[PDB]
Coordinates of C-alpha atoms and ligand atoms in Angstrom, one line a residue:
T11 CA -16.8 3.2 17.0
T12 CA -16.0 3.0 13.3
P13 CA -13.3 3.5 10.8
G14 CA -14.4 7.0 8.6
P15 CA -12.8 7.1 5.0
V16 CA -9.7 9.3 6.0
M17 CA -5.8 8.2 6.4
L18 CA -3.9 10.4 7.4
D19 CA -0.5 11.3 9.9
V20 CA 0.8 12.0 12.9
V21 CA 3.0 15.3 14.4
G22 CA 5.1 12.6 15.5
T23 CA 7.0 10.3 17.1
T24 CA 4.5 10.4 20.6
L25 CA 1.8 11.9 20.1
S26 CA 0.7 15.1 21.0
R27 CA -2.8 16.3 21.9
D28 CA -3.4 17.4 18.1
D29 CA -3.0 14.2 17.0
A30 CA -5.3 13.0 19.4
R31 CA -8.1 14.9 18.0
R32 CA -8.0 14.0 14.7
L33 CA -8.0 10.1 15.8
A34 CA -11.1 10.6 17.4
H35 CA -13.1 12.1 14.4
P36 CA -15.8 9.9 12.9
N37 CA -14.0 10.4 9.5
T38 CA -10.6 9.2 10.7
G39 CA -10.1 5.3 9.8
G40 CA -6.1 4.9 9.4
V41 CA -2.9 6.7 10.4
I42 CA -0.4 5.9 8.0
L43 CA 3.7 6.3 9.4
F44 CA 6.7 7.9 8.1
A45 CA 10.5 7.8 8.9
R46 CA 10.2 10.5 11.2
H47 CA 7.5 8.7 12.8
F48 CA 10.3 6.1 14.0
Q49 CA 13.1 6.4 16.2
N50 CA 13.6 3.0 17.5
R51 CA 11.5 -0.2 18.1
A52 CA 10.0 0.3 21.5
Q53 CA 9.2 4.2 21.0
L54 CA 7.0 2.9 17.6
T55 CA 5.2 -0.3 20.2
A56 CA 4.4 2.5 22.6
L57 CA 3.1 5.3 20.3
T58 CA 1.2 2.7 17.4
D59 CA -0.3 1.5 21.4
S60 CA -1.2 4.9 22.2
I61 CA -2.7 5.5 18.6
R62 CA -5.0 2.3 19.1
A63 CA -6.1 3.5 22.7
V64 CA -7.5 6.8 21.1
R65 CA -9.5 5.0 18.5
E66 CA -9.7 1.4 18.5
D67 CA -10.4 0.8 15.8
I68 CA -8.5 2.6 13.7
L69 CA -5.9 1.0 10.4
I70 CA -2.0 1.7 10.7
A71 CA 0.0 1.2 8.1
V72 CA 3.3 1.7 6.6
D73 CA 5.0 1.9 3.3
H74 CA 7.2 -1.7 3.6
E75 CA 8.1 -2.6 0.7
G76 CA 12.1 -2.7 0.8
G77 CA 14.8 -0.6 -2.2
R78 CA 14.2 2.8 -2.1
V79 CA 10.7 2.2 -0.2
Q80 CA 11.3 1.3 3.6
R81 CA 10.7 4.1 6.1
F82 CA 12.0 1.7 9.5
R83 CA 15.5 0.7 8.5
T84 CA 17.7 0.6 11.1
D85 CA 16.9 -1.8 15.2
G86 CA 16.4 -4.3 13.9
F87 CA 14.2 -4.1 11.5
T88 CA 15.1 -6.2 8.1
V89 CA 16.2 -3.7 5.2
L90 CA 14.6 -6.0 2.3
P91 CA 15.7 -6.1 -0.9
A92 CA 13.8 -3.8 -3.8
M93 CA 11.4 -5.8 -5.4
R94 CA 13.2 -6.0 -9.2
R95 CA 16.0 -8.3 -6.8
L96 CA 13.5 -10.8 -6.1
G97 CA 13.3 -10.6 -10.6
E98 CA 16.4 -10.6 -11.2
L99 CA 16.6 -14.2 -8.6
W100 CA 13.5 -15.2 -10.8
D101 CA 15.2 -15.4 -14.2
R102 CA 18.1 -17.8 -12.3
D103 CA 16.1 -20.6 -10.7
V104 CA 12.0 -19.3 -10.5
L105 CA 10.9 -21.9 -7.5
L106 CA 14.1 -20.0 -5.5
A107 CA 12.6 -16.7 -6.4
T108 CA 9.0 -18.2 -5.1
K109 CA 10.6 -19.6 -1.7
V110 CA 12.5 -16.1 -0.7
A111 CA 9.8 -13.9 -1.9
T112 CA 8.1 -15.8 0.9
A113 CA 10.4 -15.7 3.3
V114 CA 10.2 -11.9 2.7
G115 CA 6.8 -11.0 3.9
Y116 CA 6.8 -13.3 6.4
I117 CA 9.9 -10.8 7.9
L118 CA 8.1 -7.7 7.0
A119 CA 4.7 -8.4 8.6
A120 CA 5.8 -10.3 11.8
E121 CA 8.4 -7.0 12.2
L122 CA 5.9 -4.7 11.5
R123 CA 3.6 -6.7 13.0
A124 CA 5.5 -7.2 16.3
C125 CA 5.5 -2.7 16.7
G126 CA 1.9 -3.3 16.0
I127 CA 0.9 -2.2 12.3
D128 CA -1.7 -3.2 10.9
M129 CA -0.5 -3.2 7.2
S130 CA 1.7 -2.5 4.6
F131 CA 1.0 -0.8 1.2
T132 CA 2.6 -3.6 -0.3
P133 CA 3.2 -5.2 -3.3
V134 CA 4.1 -2.8 -6.4
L135 CA 2.3 -4.9 -9.0
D136 CA 3.4 -2.0 -12.4
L137 CA 5.6 -3.7 -14.5
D138 CA 9.3 -3.2 -15.2
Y139 CA 8.8 -1.2 -18.6
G140 CA 11.6 0.5 -17.6
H141 CA 9.6 3.7 -18.3
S142 CA 9.1 5.1 -15.4
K143 CA 11.9 6.5 -13.0
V144 CA 9.5 6.3 -10.0
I145 CA 9.0 3.4 -9.8
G146 CA 12.3 2.0 -11.6
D147 CA 13.1 -0.9 -8.6
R148 CA 9.8 -1.9 -6.8
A149 CA 8.8 -3.3 -9.6
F150 CA 9.5 -7.2 -9.2
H151 CA 9.6 -7.9 -12.8
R152 CA 8.1 -6.9 -16.5
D153 CA 6.1 -9.8 -17.6
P154 CA 2.7 -9.7 -15.7
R155 CA 2.7 -13.4 -15.1
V156 CA 5.9 -13.3 -13.0
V157 CA 4.8 -10.1 -11.3
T158 CA 1.7 -11.7 -10.0
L159 CA 2.8 -15.5 -9.1
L160 CA 5.7 -13.4 -6.9
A161 CA 4.1 -10.7 -5.5
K162 CA 1.3 -13.8 -4.2
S163 CA 4.2 -15.3 -2.8
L164 CA 5.2 -12.9 -0.7
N165 CA 1.6 -12.5 0.1
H166 CA 1.8 -15.3 1.6
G167 CA 4.7 -14.5 3.8
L168 CA 2.3 -11.5 4.5
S169 CA -0.7 -14.1 5.2
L170 CA 1.9 -16.4 7.4
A171 CA 1.7 -13.3 10.4
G172 CA -2.3 -12.5 9.8
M173 CA -1.0 -9.7 8.1
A174 CA -3.3 -8.6 4.9
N175 CA -1.8 -6.6 1.7
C176 CA -2.1 -3.8 -0.8
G177 CA -2.0 -4.5 -4.7
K178 CA -0.5 -0.6 -6.6
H179 CA -0.5 1.1 -8.3
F180 CA -4.2 0.2 -10.2
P181 CA -4.4 -0.1 -13.6
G182 CA -0.5 1.0 -13.8
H183 CA 1.7 3.3 -13.1
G184 CA 4.7 1.6 -15.0
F185 CA 4.1 2.6 -18.8
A186 CA 4.0 6.2 -17.7
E187 CA 7.6 8.6 -17.7
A188 CA 6.3 11.3 -15.4
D189 CA 6.5 11.2 -11.6
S190 CA 2.8 11.0 -10.0
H191 CA 4.7 13.3 -6.9
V192 CA 5.2 16.5 -9.0
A193 CA 3.3 16.0 -12.1
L194 CA 0.6 14.9 -13.7
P195 CA 1.7 11.3 -15.9
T196 CA 0.3 10.0 -18.6
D197 CA -0.5 6.7 -20.4
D198 CA -2.2 7.2 -23.9
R199 CA -2.7 2.9 -24.7
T200 CA -5.6 1.3 -25.4
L201 CA -8.2 0.4 -22.9
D202 CA -7.6 -3.2 -24.5
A203 CA -3.8 -3.3 -24.0
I204 CA -3.6 -1.8 -20.2
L205 CA -5.9 -5.2 -19.1
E206 CA -4.4 -7.7 -21.0
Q207 CA -1.1 -6.9 -19.0
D208 CA -0.5 -4.4 -16.7
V209 CA -4.3 -4.8 -15.1
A210 CA -4.1 -8.8 -15.7
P211 CA -2.3 -9.4 -11.9
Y212 CA -4.5 -7.8 -10.6
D213 CA -7.2 -10.2 -12.0
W214 CA -4.9 -13.4 -11.8
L215 CA -4.5 -13.1 -8.1
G216 CA -7.7 -13.5 -7.2
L217 CA -8.1 -13.4 -3.4
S218 CA -4.6 -13.7 -3.1
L219 CA -5.6 -9.5 -3.6
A220 CA -6.3 -7.6 -0.7
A221 CA -6.7 -4.3 -1.4
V222 CA -5.9 -1.9 -3.7
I223 CA -4.3 1.5 -4.8
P224 CA -4.5 3.0 -7.2
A225 CA -2.4 5.7 -9.9
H226 CA -3.0 9.0 -9.9
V227 CA -2.6 8.9 -13.3
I228 CA -4.1 9.9 -17.0
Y229 CA -4.5 7.3 -19.0
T230 CA -6.0 9.4 -22.1
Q231 CA -7.6 6.9 -24.8
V232 CA -9.9 5.5 -21.0
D233 CA -10.8 8.6 -19.5
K234 CA -10.2 11.9 -18.5
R235 CA -9.9 11.7 -15.1
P236 CA -6.7 9.9 -13.9
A237 CA -7.3 6.0 -12.1
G238 CA -8.4 7.3 -8.6
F239 CA -10.6 9.5 -9.0
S240 CA -12.3 7.3 -12.0
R241 CA -15.6 5.9 -11.8
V242 CA -14.3 3.7 -14.8
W243 CA -11.1 2.2 -13.3
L244 CA -12.4 1.6 -10.4
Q245 CA -16.2 0.8 -10.9
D246 CA -16.5 -0.5 -14.1
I247 CA -13.1 -2.3 -14.2
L248 CA -12.2 -2.7 -11.0
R249 CA -15.2 -3.5 -9.5
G250 CA -17.2 -4.3 -12.6
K251 CA -14.8 -6.4 -15.3
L252 CA -12.7 -8.1 -12.7
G253 CA -15.3 -8.4 -9.4
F254 CA -12.7 -6.7 -6.4
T255 CA -13.9 -6.4 -3.6
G256 CA -10.7 -5.9 -1.4
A257 CA -10.2 -2.3 -0.2
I258 CA -9.3 0.5 -2.1
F259 CA -7.6 3.2 -0.3
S260 CA -6.8 6.7 -2.7
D261 CA -2.9 7.4 -3.3
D262 CA -2.0 10.0 -1.8
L263 CA -4.2 13.3 -1.7
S264 CA -1.1 16.1 -1.0
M265 CA 0.6 14.3 -4.1
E266 CA 1.4 17.1 -7.6
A267 CA -0.4 14.8 -9.8
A268 CA -4.1 14.5 -7.5
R269 CA -4.4 18.2 -7.5
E270 CA -6.1 17.6 -11.2
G271 CA -8.9 16.5 -8.3
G272 CA -9.3 20.5 -6.7
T273 CA -8.9 21.7 -3.6
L274 CA -7.7 18.5 -1.0
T275 CA -11.4 18.4 -0.1
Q276 CA -13.0 19.0 -3.9
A277 CA -10.7 15.7 -4.4
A278 CA -11.2 13.4 -1.8
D279 CA -15.1 13.7 -3.0
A280 CA -14.0 12.9 -6.0
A281 CA -12.2 10.1 -4.6
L282 CA -14.8 8.5 -2.7
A283 CA -17.6 9.8 -4.8
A284 CA -15.4 7.0 -7.7
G285 CA -15.1 4.2 -5.6
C286 CA -12.4 4.4 -3.4
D287 CA -13.4 3.1 0.2
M288 CA -10.5 5.6 2.5
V289 CA -8.6 8.3 1.2
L290 CA -4.5 8.8 2.2
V291 CA -3.7 12.8 3.0
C292 CA 0.1 12.5 4.2
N293 CA 2.4 15.5 5.5
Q294 CA -0.5 18.0 6.2
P295 CA -2.9 17.0 9.4
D296 CA -3.4 20.6 9.0
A297 CA -4.8 20.3 5.7
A298 CA -6.4 16.6 6.6
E299 CA -8.3 17.9 9.1
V300 CA -10.3 20.1 7.0
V301 CA -11.0 17.7 4.4
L302 CA -12.0 15.1 8.0
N303 CA -14.7 17.6 8.8
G304 CA -15.0 19.3 4.9
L305 CA -16.1 16.1 3.7
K306 CA -19.3 15.7 2.1
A307 CA -21.5 12.8 3.2
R308 CA -21.9 9.7 1.1
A309 CA -23.3 6.1 1.6
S310 CA -19.8 3.5 3.7
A311 CA -21.6 0.7 4.8
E312 CA -19.6 -1.1 1.8
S313 CA -16.5 0.6 2.0
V314 CA -16.6 0.0 6.3
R315 CA -16.3 -3.7 5.8
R316 CA -13.9 -4.0 3.6
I317 CA -11.6 -1.5 5.6
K318 CA -12.3 -3.7 8.4
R319 CA -11.3 -6.5 6.5
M320 CA -7.5 -5.1 6.3
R321 CA -6.5 -4.9 10.6
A322 CA -3.6 -7.2 10.7
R323 CA -5.6 -11.5 11.8
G324 CA -4.7 -12.5 14.9
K325 CA -2.4 -12.2 18.0
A326 CA 1.4 -11.0 16.5
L327 CA 4.6 -12.9 18.8
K328 CA 6.1 -9.0 20.3
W329 CA 9.3 -8.7 19.7
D330 CA 10.3 -10.8 22.8
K331 CA 9.2 -14.0 21.0
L332 CA 10.0 -13.5 17.2
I333 CA 13.8 -12.9 17.8
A334 CA 14.0 -16.4 18.9
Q335 CA 11.5 -17.9 16.8
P336 CA 13.0 -20.7 14.6
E337 CA 10.5 -19.9 11.1
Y338 CA 12.0 -15.8 11.9
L339 CA 15.6 -17.1 11.4
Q340 CA 15.1 -20.0 8.6
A341 CA 13.2 -17.4 6.8
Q342 CA 16.0 -14.4 7.5
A343 CA 18.9 -17.0 6.8
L344 CA 17.2 -17.3 3.1
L345 CA 17.4 -13.8 2.7
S346 CA 20.8 -13.4 3.4
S347 CA 22.4 -16.9 1.4
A348 CA 19.4 -16.1 -2.5
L349 CA 20.8 -12.2 -2.6
Ligands
LIG401 C1 3.4 6.7 -6.9 C2 3.9 5.8 -5.8 O1 5.0 6.3 -5.8 N1 3.3 6.4 -4.7 C3 3.4 6.4 -2.8 C4 3.4 7.4 -2.8 N2 2.3 8.4 -2.0 C5 1.7 7.0 -1.0 C6 2.0 6.4 -0.3 O2 3.3 6.8 0.6 C7 3.0 5.0 -1.3 O3 2.5 3.5 -1.0 C8 2.1 5.2 -3.0 O4 3.1 3.5 -2.5

């Protein structure tokens, strides 16, 4: 089988029949995991094994950014710094910050792969304007050039463990005031101002950028539709102007900002019509199931190529080997000392 366009979640720490029904649905492409899905490493590994036993082509992801966004923080998962801490380190020693960024990405990726997870929805490329509380310390730095090179260094670390990446929230959640979880944010700048600064890391990363999540933010001088529902942002700018060929994942359609798109099924249709390859529907698996069964038909072949490319590459070390690996051990020591 081949992956569908919907990324949803499972009900708990072990798979239920309802989960297995949803996982088997042709429109399912992925699972996103949250803190409630984690008791310990052994339980998590068994959960991801069982998910792949139902659907072998499934993508498994998690939000592991560090700082305030890190779902697994116990039983041996390394608590990672907020990305803002890396920008602060850069302001003292640029080269060391890049070295530390790579170590963070390697630890991050290697620990997740040891538990059977394909990817993390990282890095945040939002610029640290200071305007956005929802982003806040999740942003690397104010300067798009600095964001770019730190994110690139992080992504390199991810790649060393065979893990891809996902830049977010395109074209930038950093300038807008409001929190898209609970309201619909706006950004009234010109297209050109947005392109010159907030979009610049997406453009400069080139092949070091594997995927994008777009913001549920309305950029009122560019398009009346939030970015994740906007063909202007997703096709004209991202695919067109930037020539990006990686996967586009919608931000979570359960977020309040996304009700600007309609019922869940209507919003999903709109995100995919706009240019998302996958849509996230989090924290309401039965509503996700209505989406799975109601989605309007579309061409998906181009999307499927991109989705398959998000699967982790090559073999991962299990925990019992990772814990003795000098590279892993070295990275741990560097993170400890440098911050
Ligand atoms: C704007 C914002 O913080 N969105 C987050 C929440 N929605 C879906 C995922 O959990 C995560 O990757 C997103 O970054």
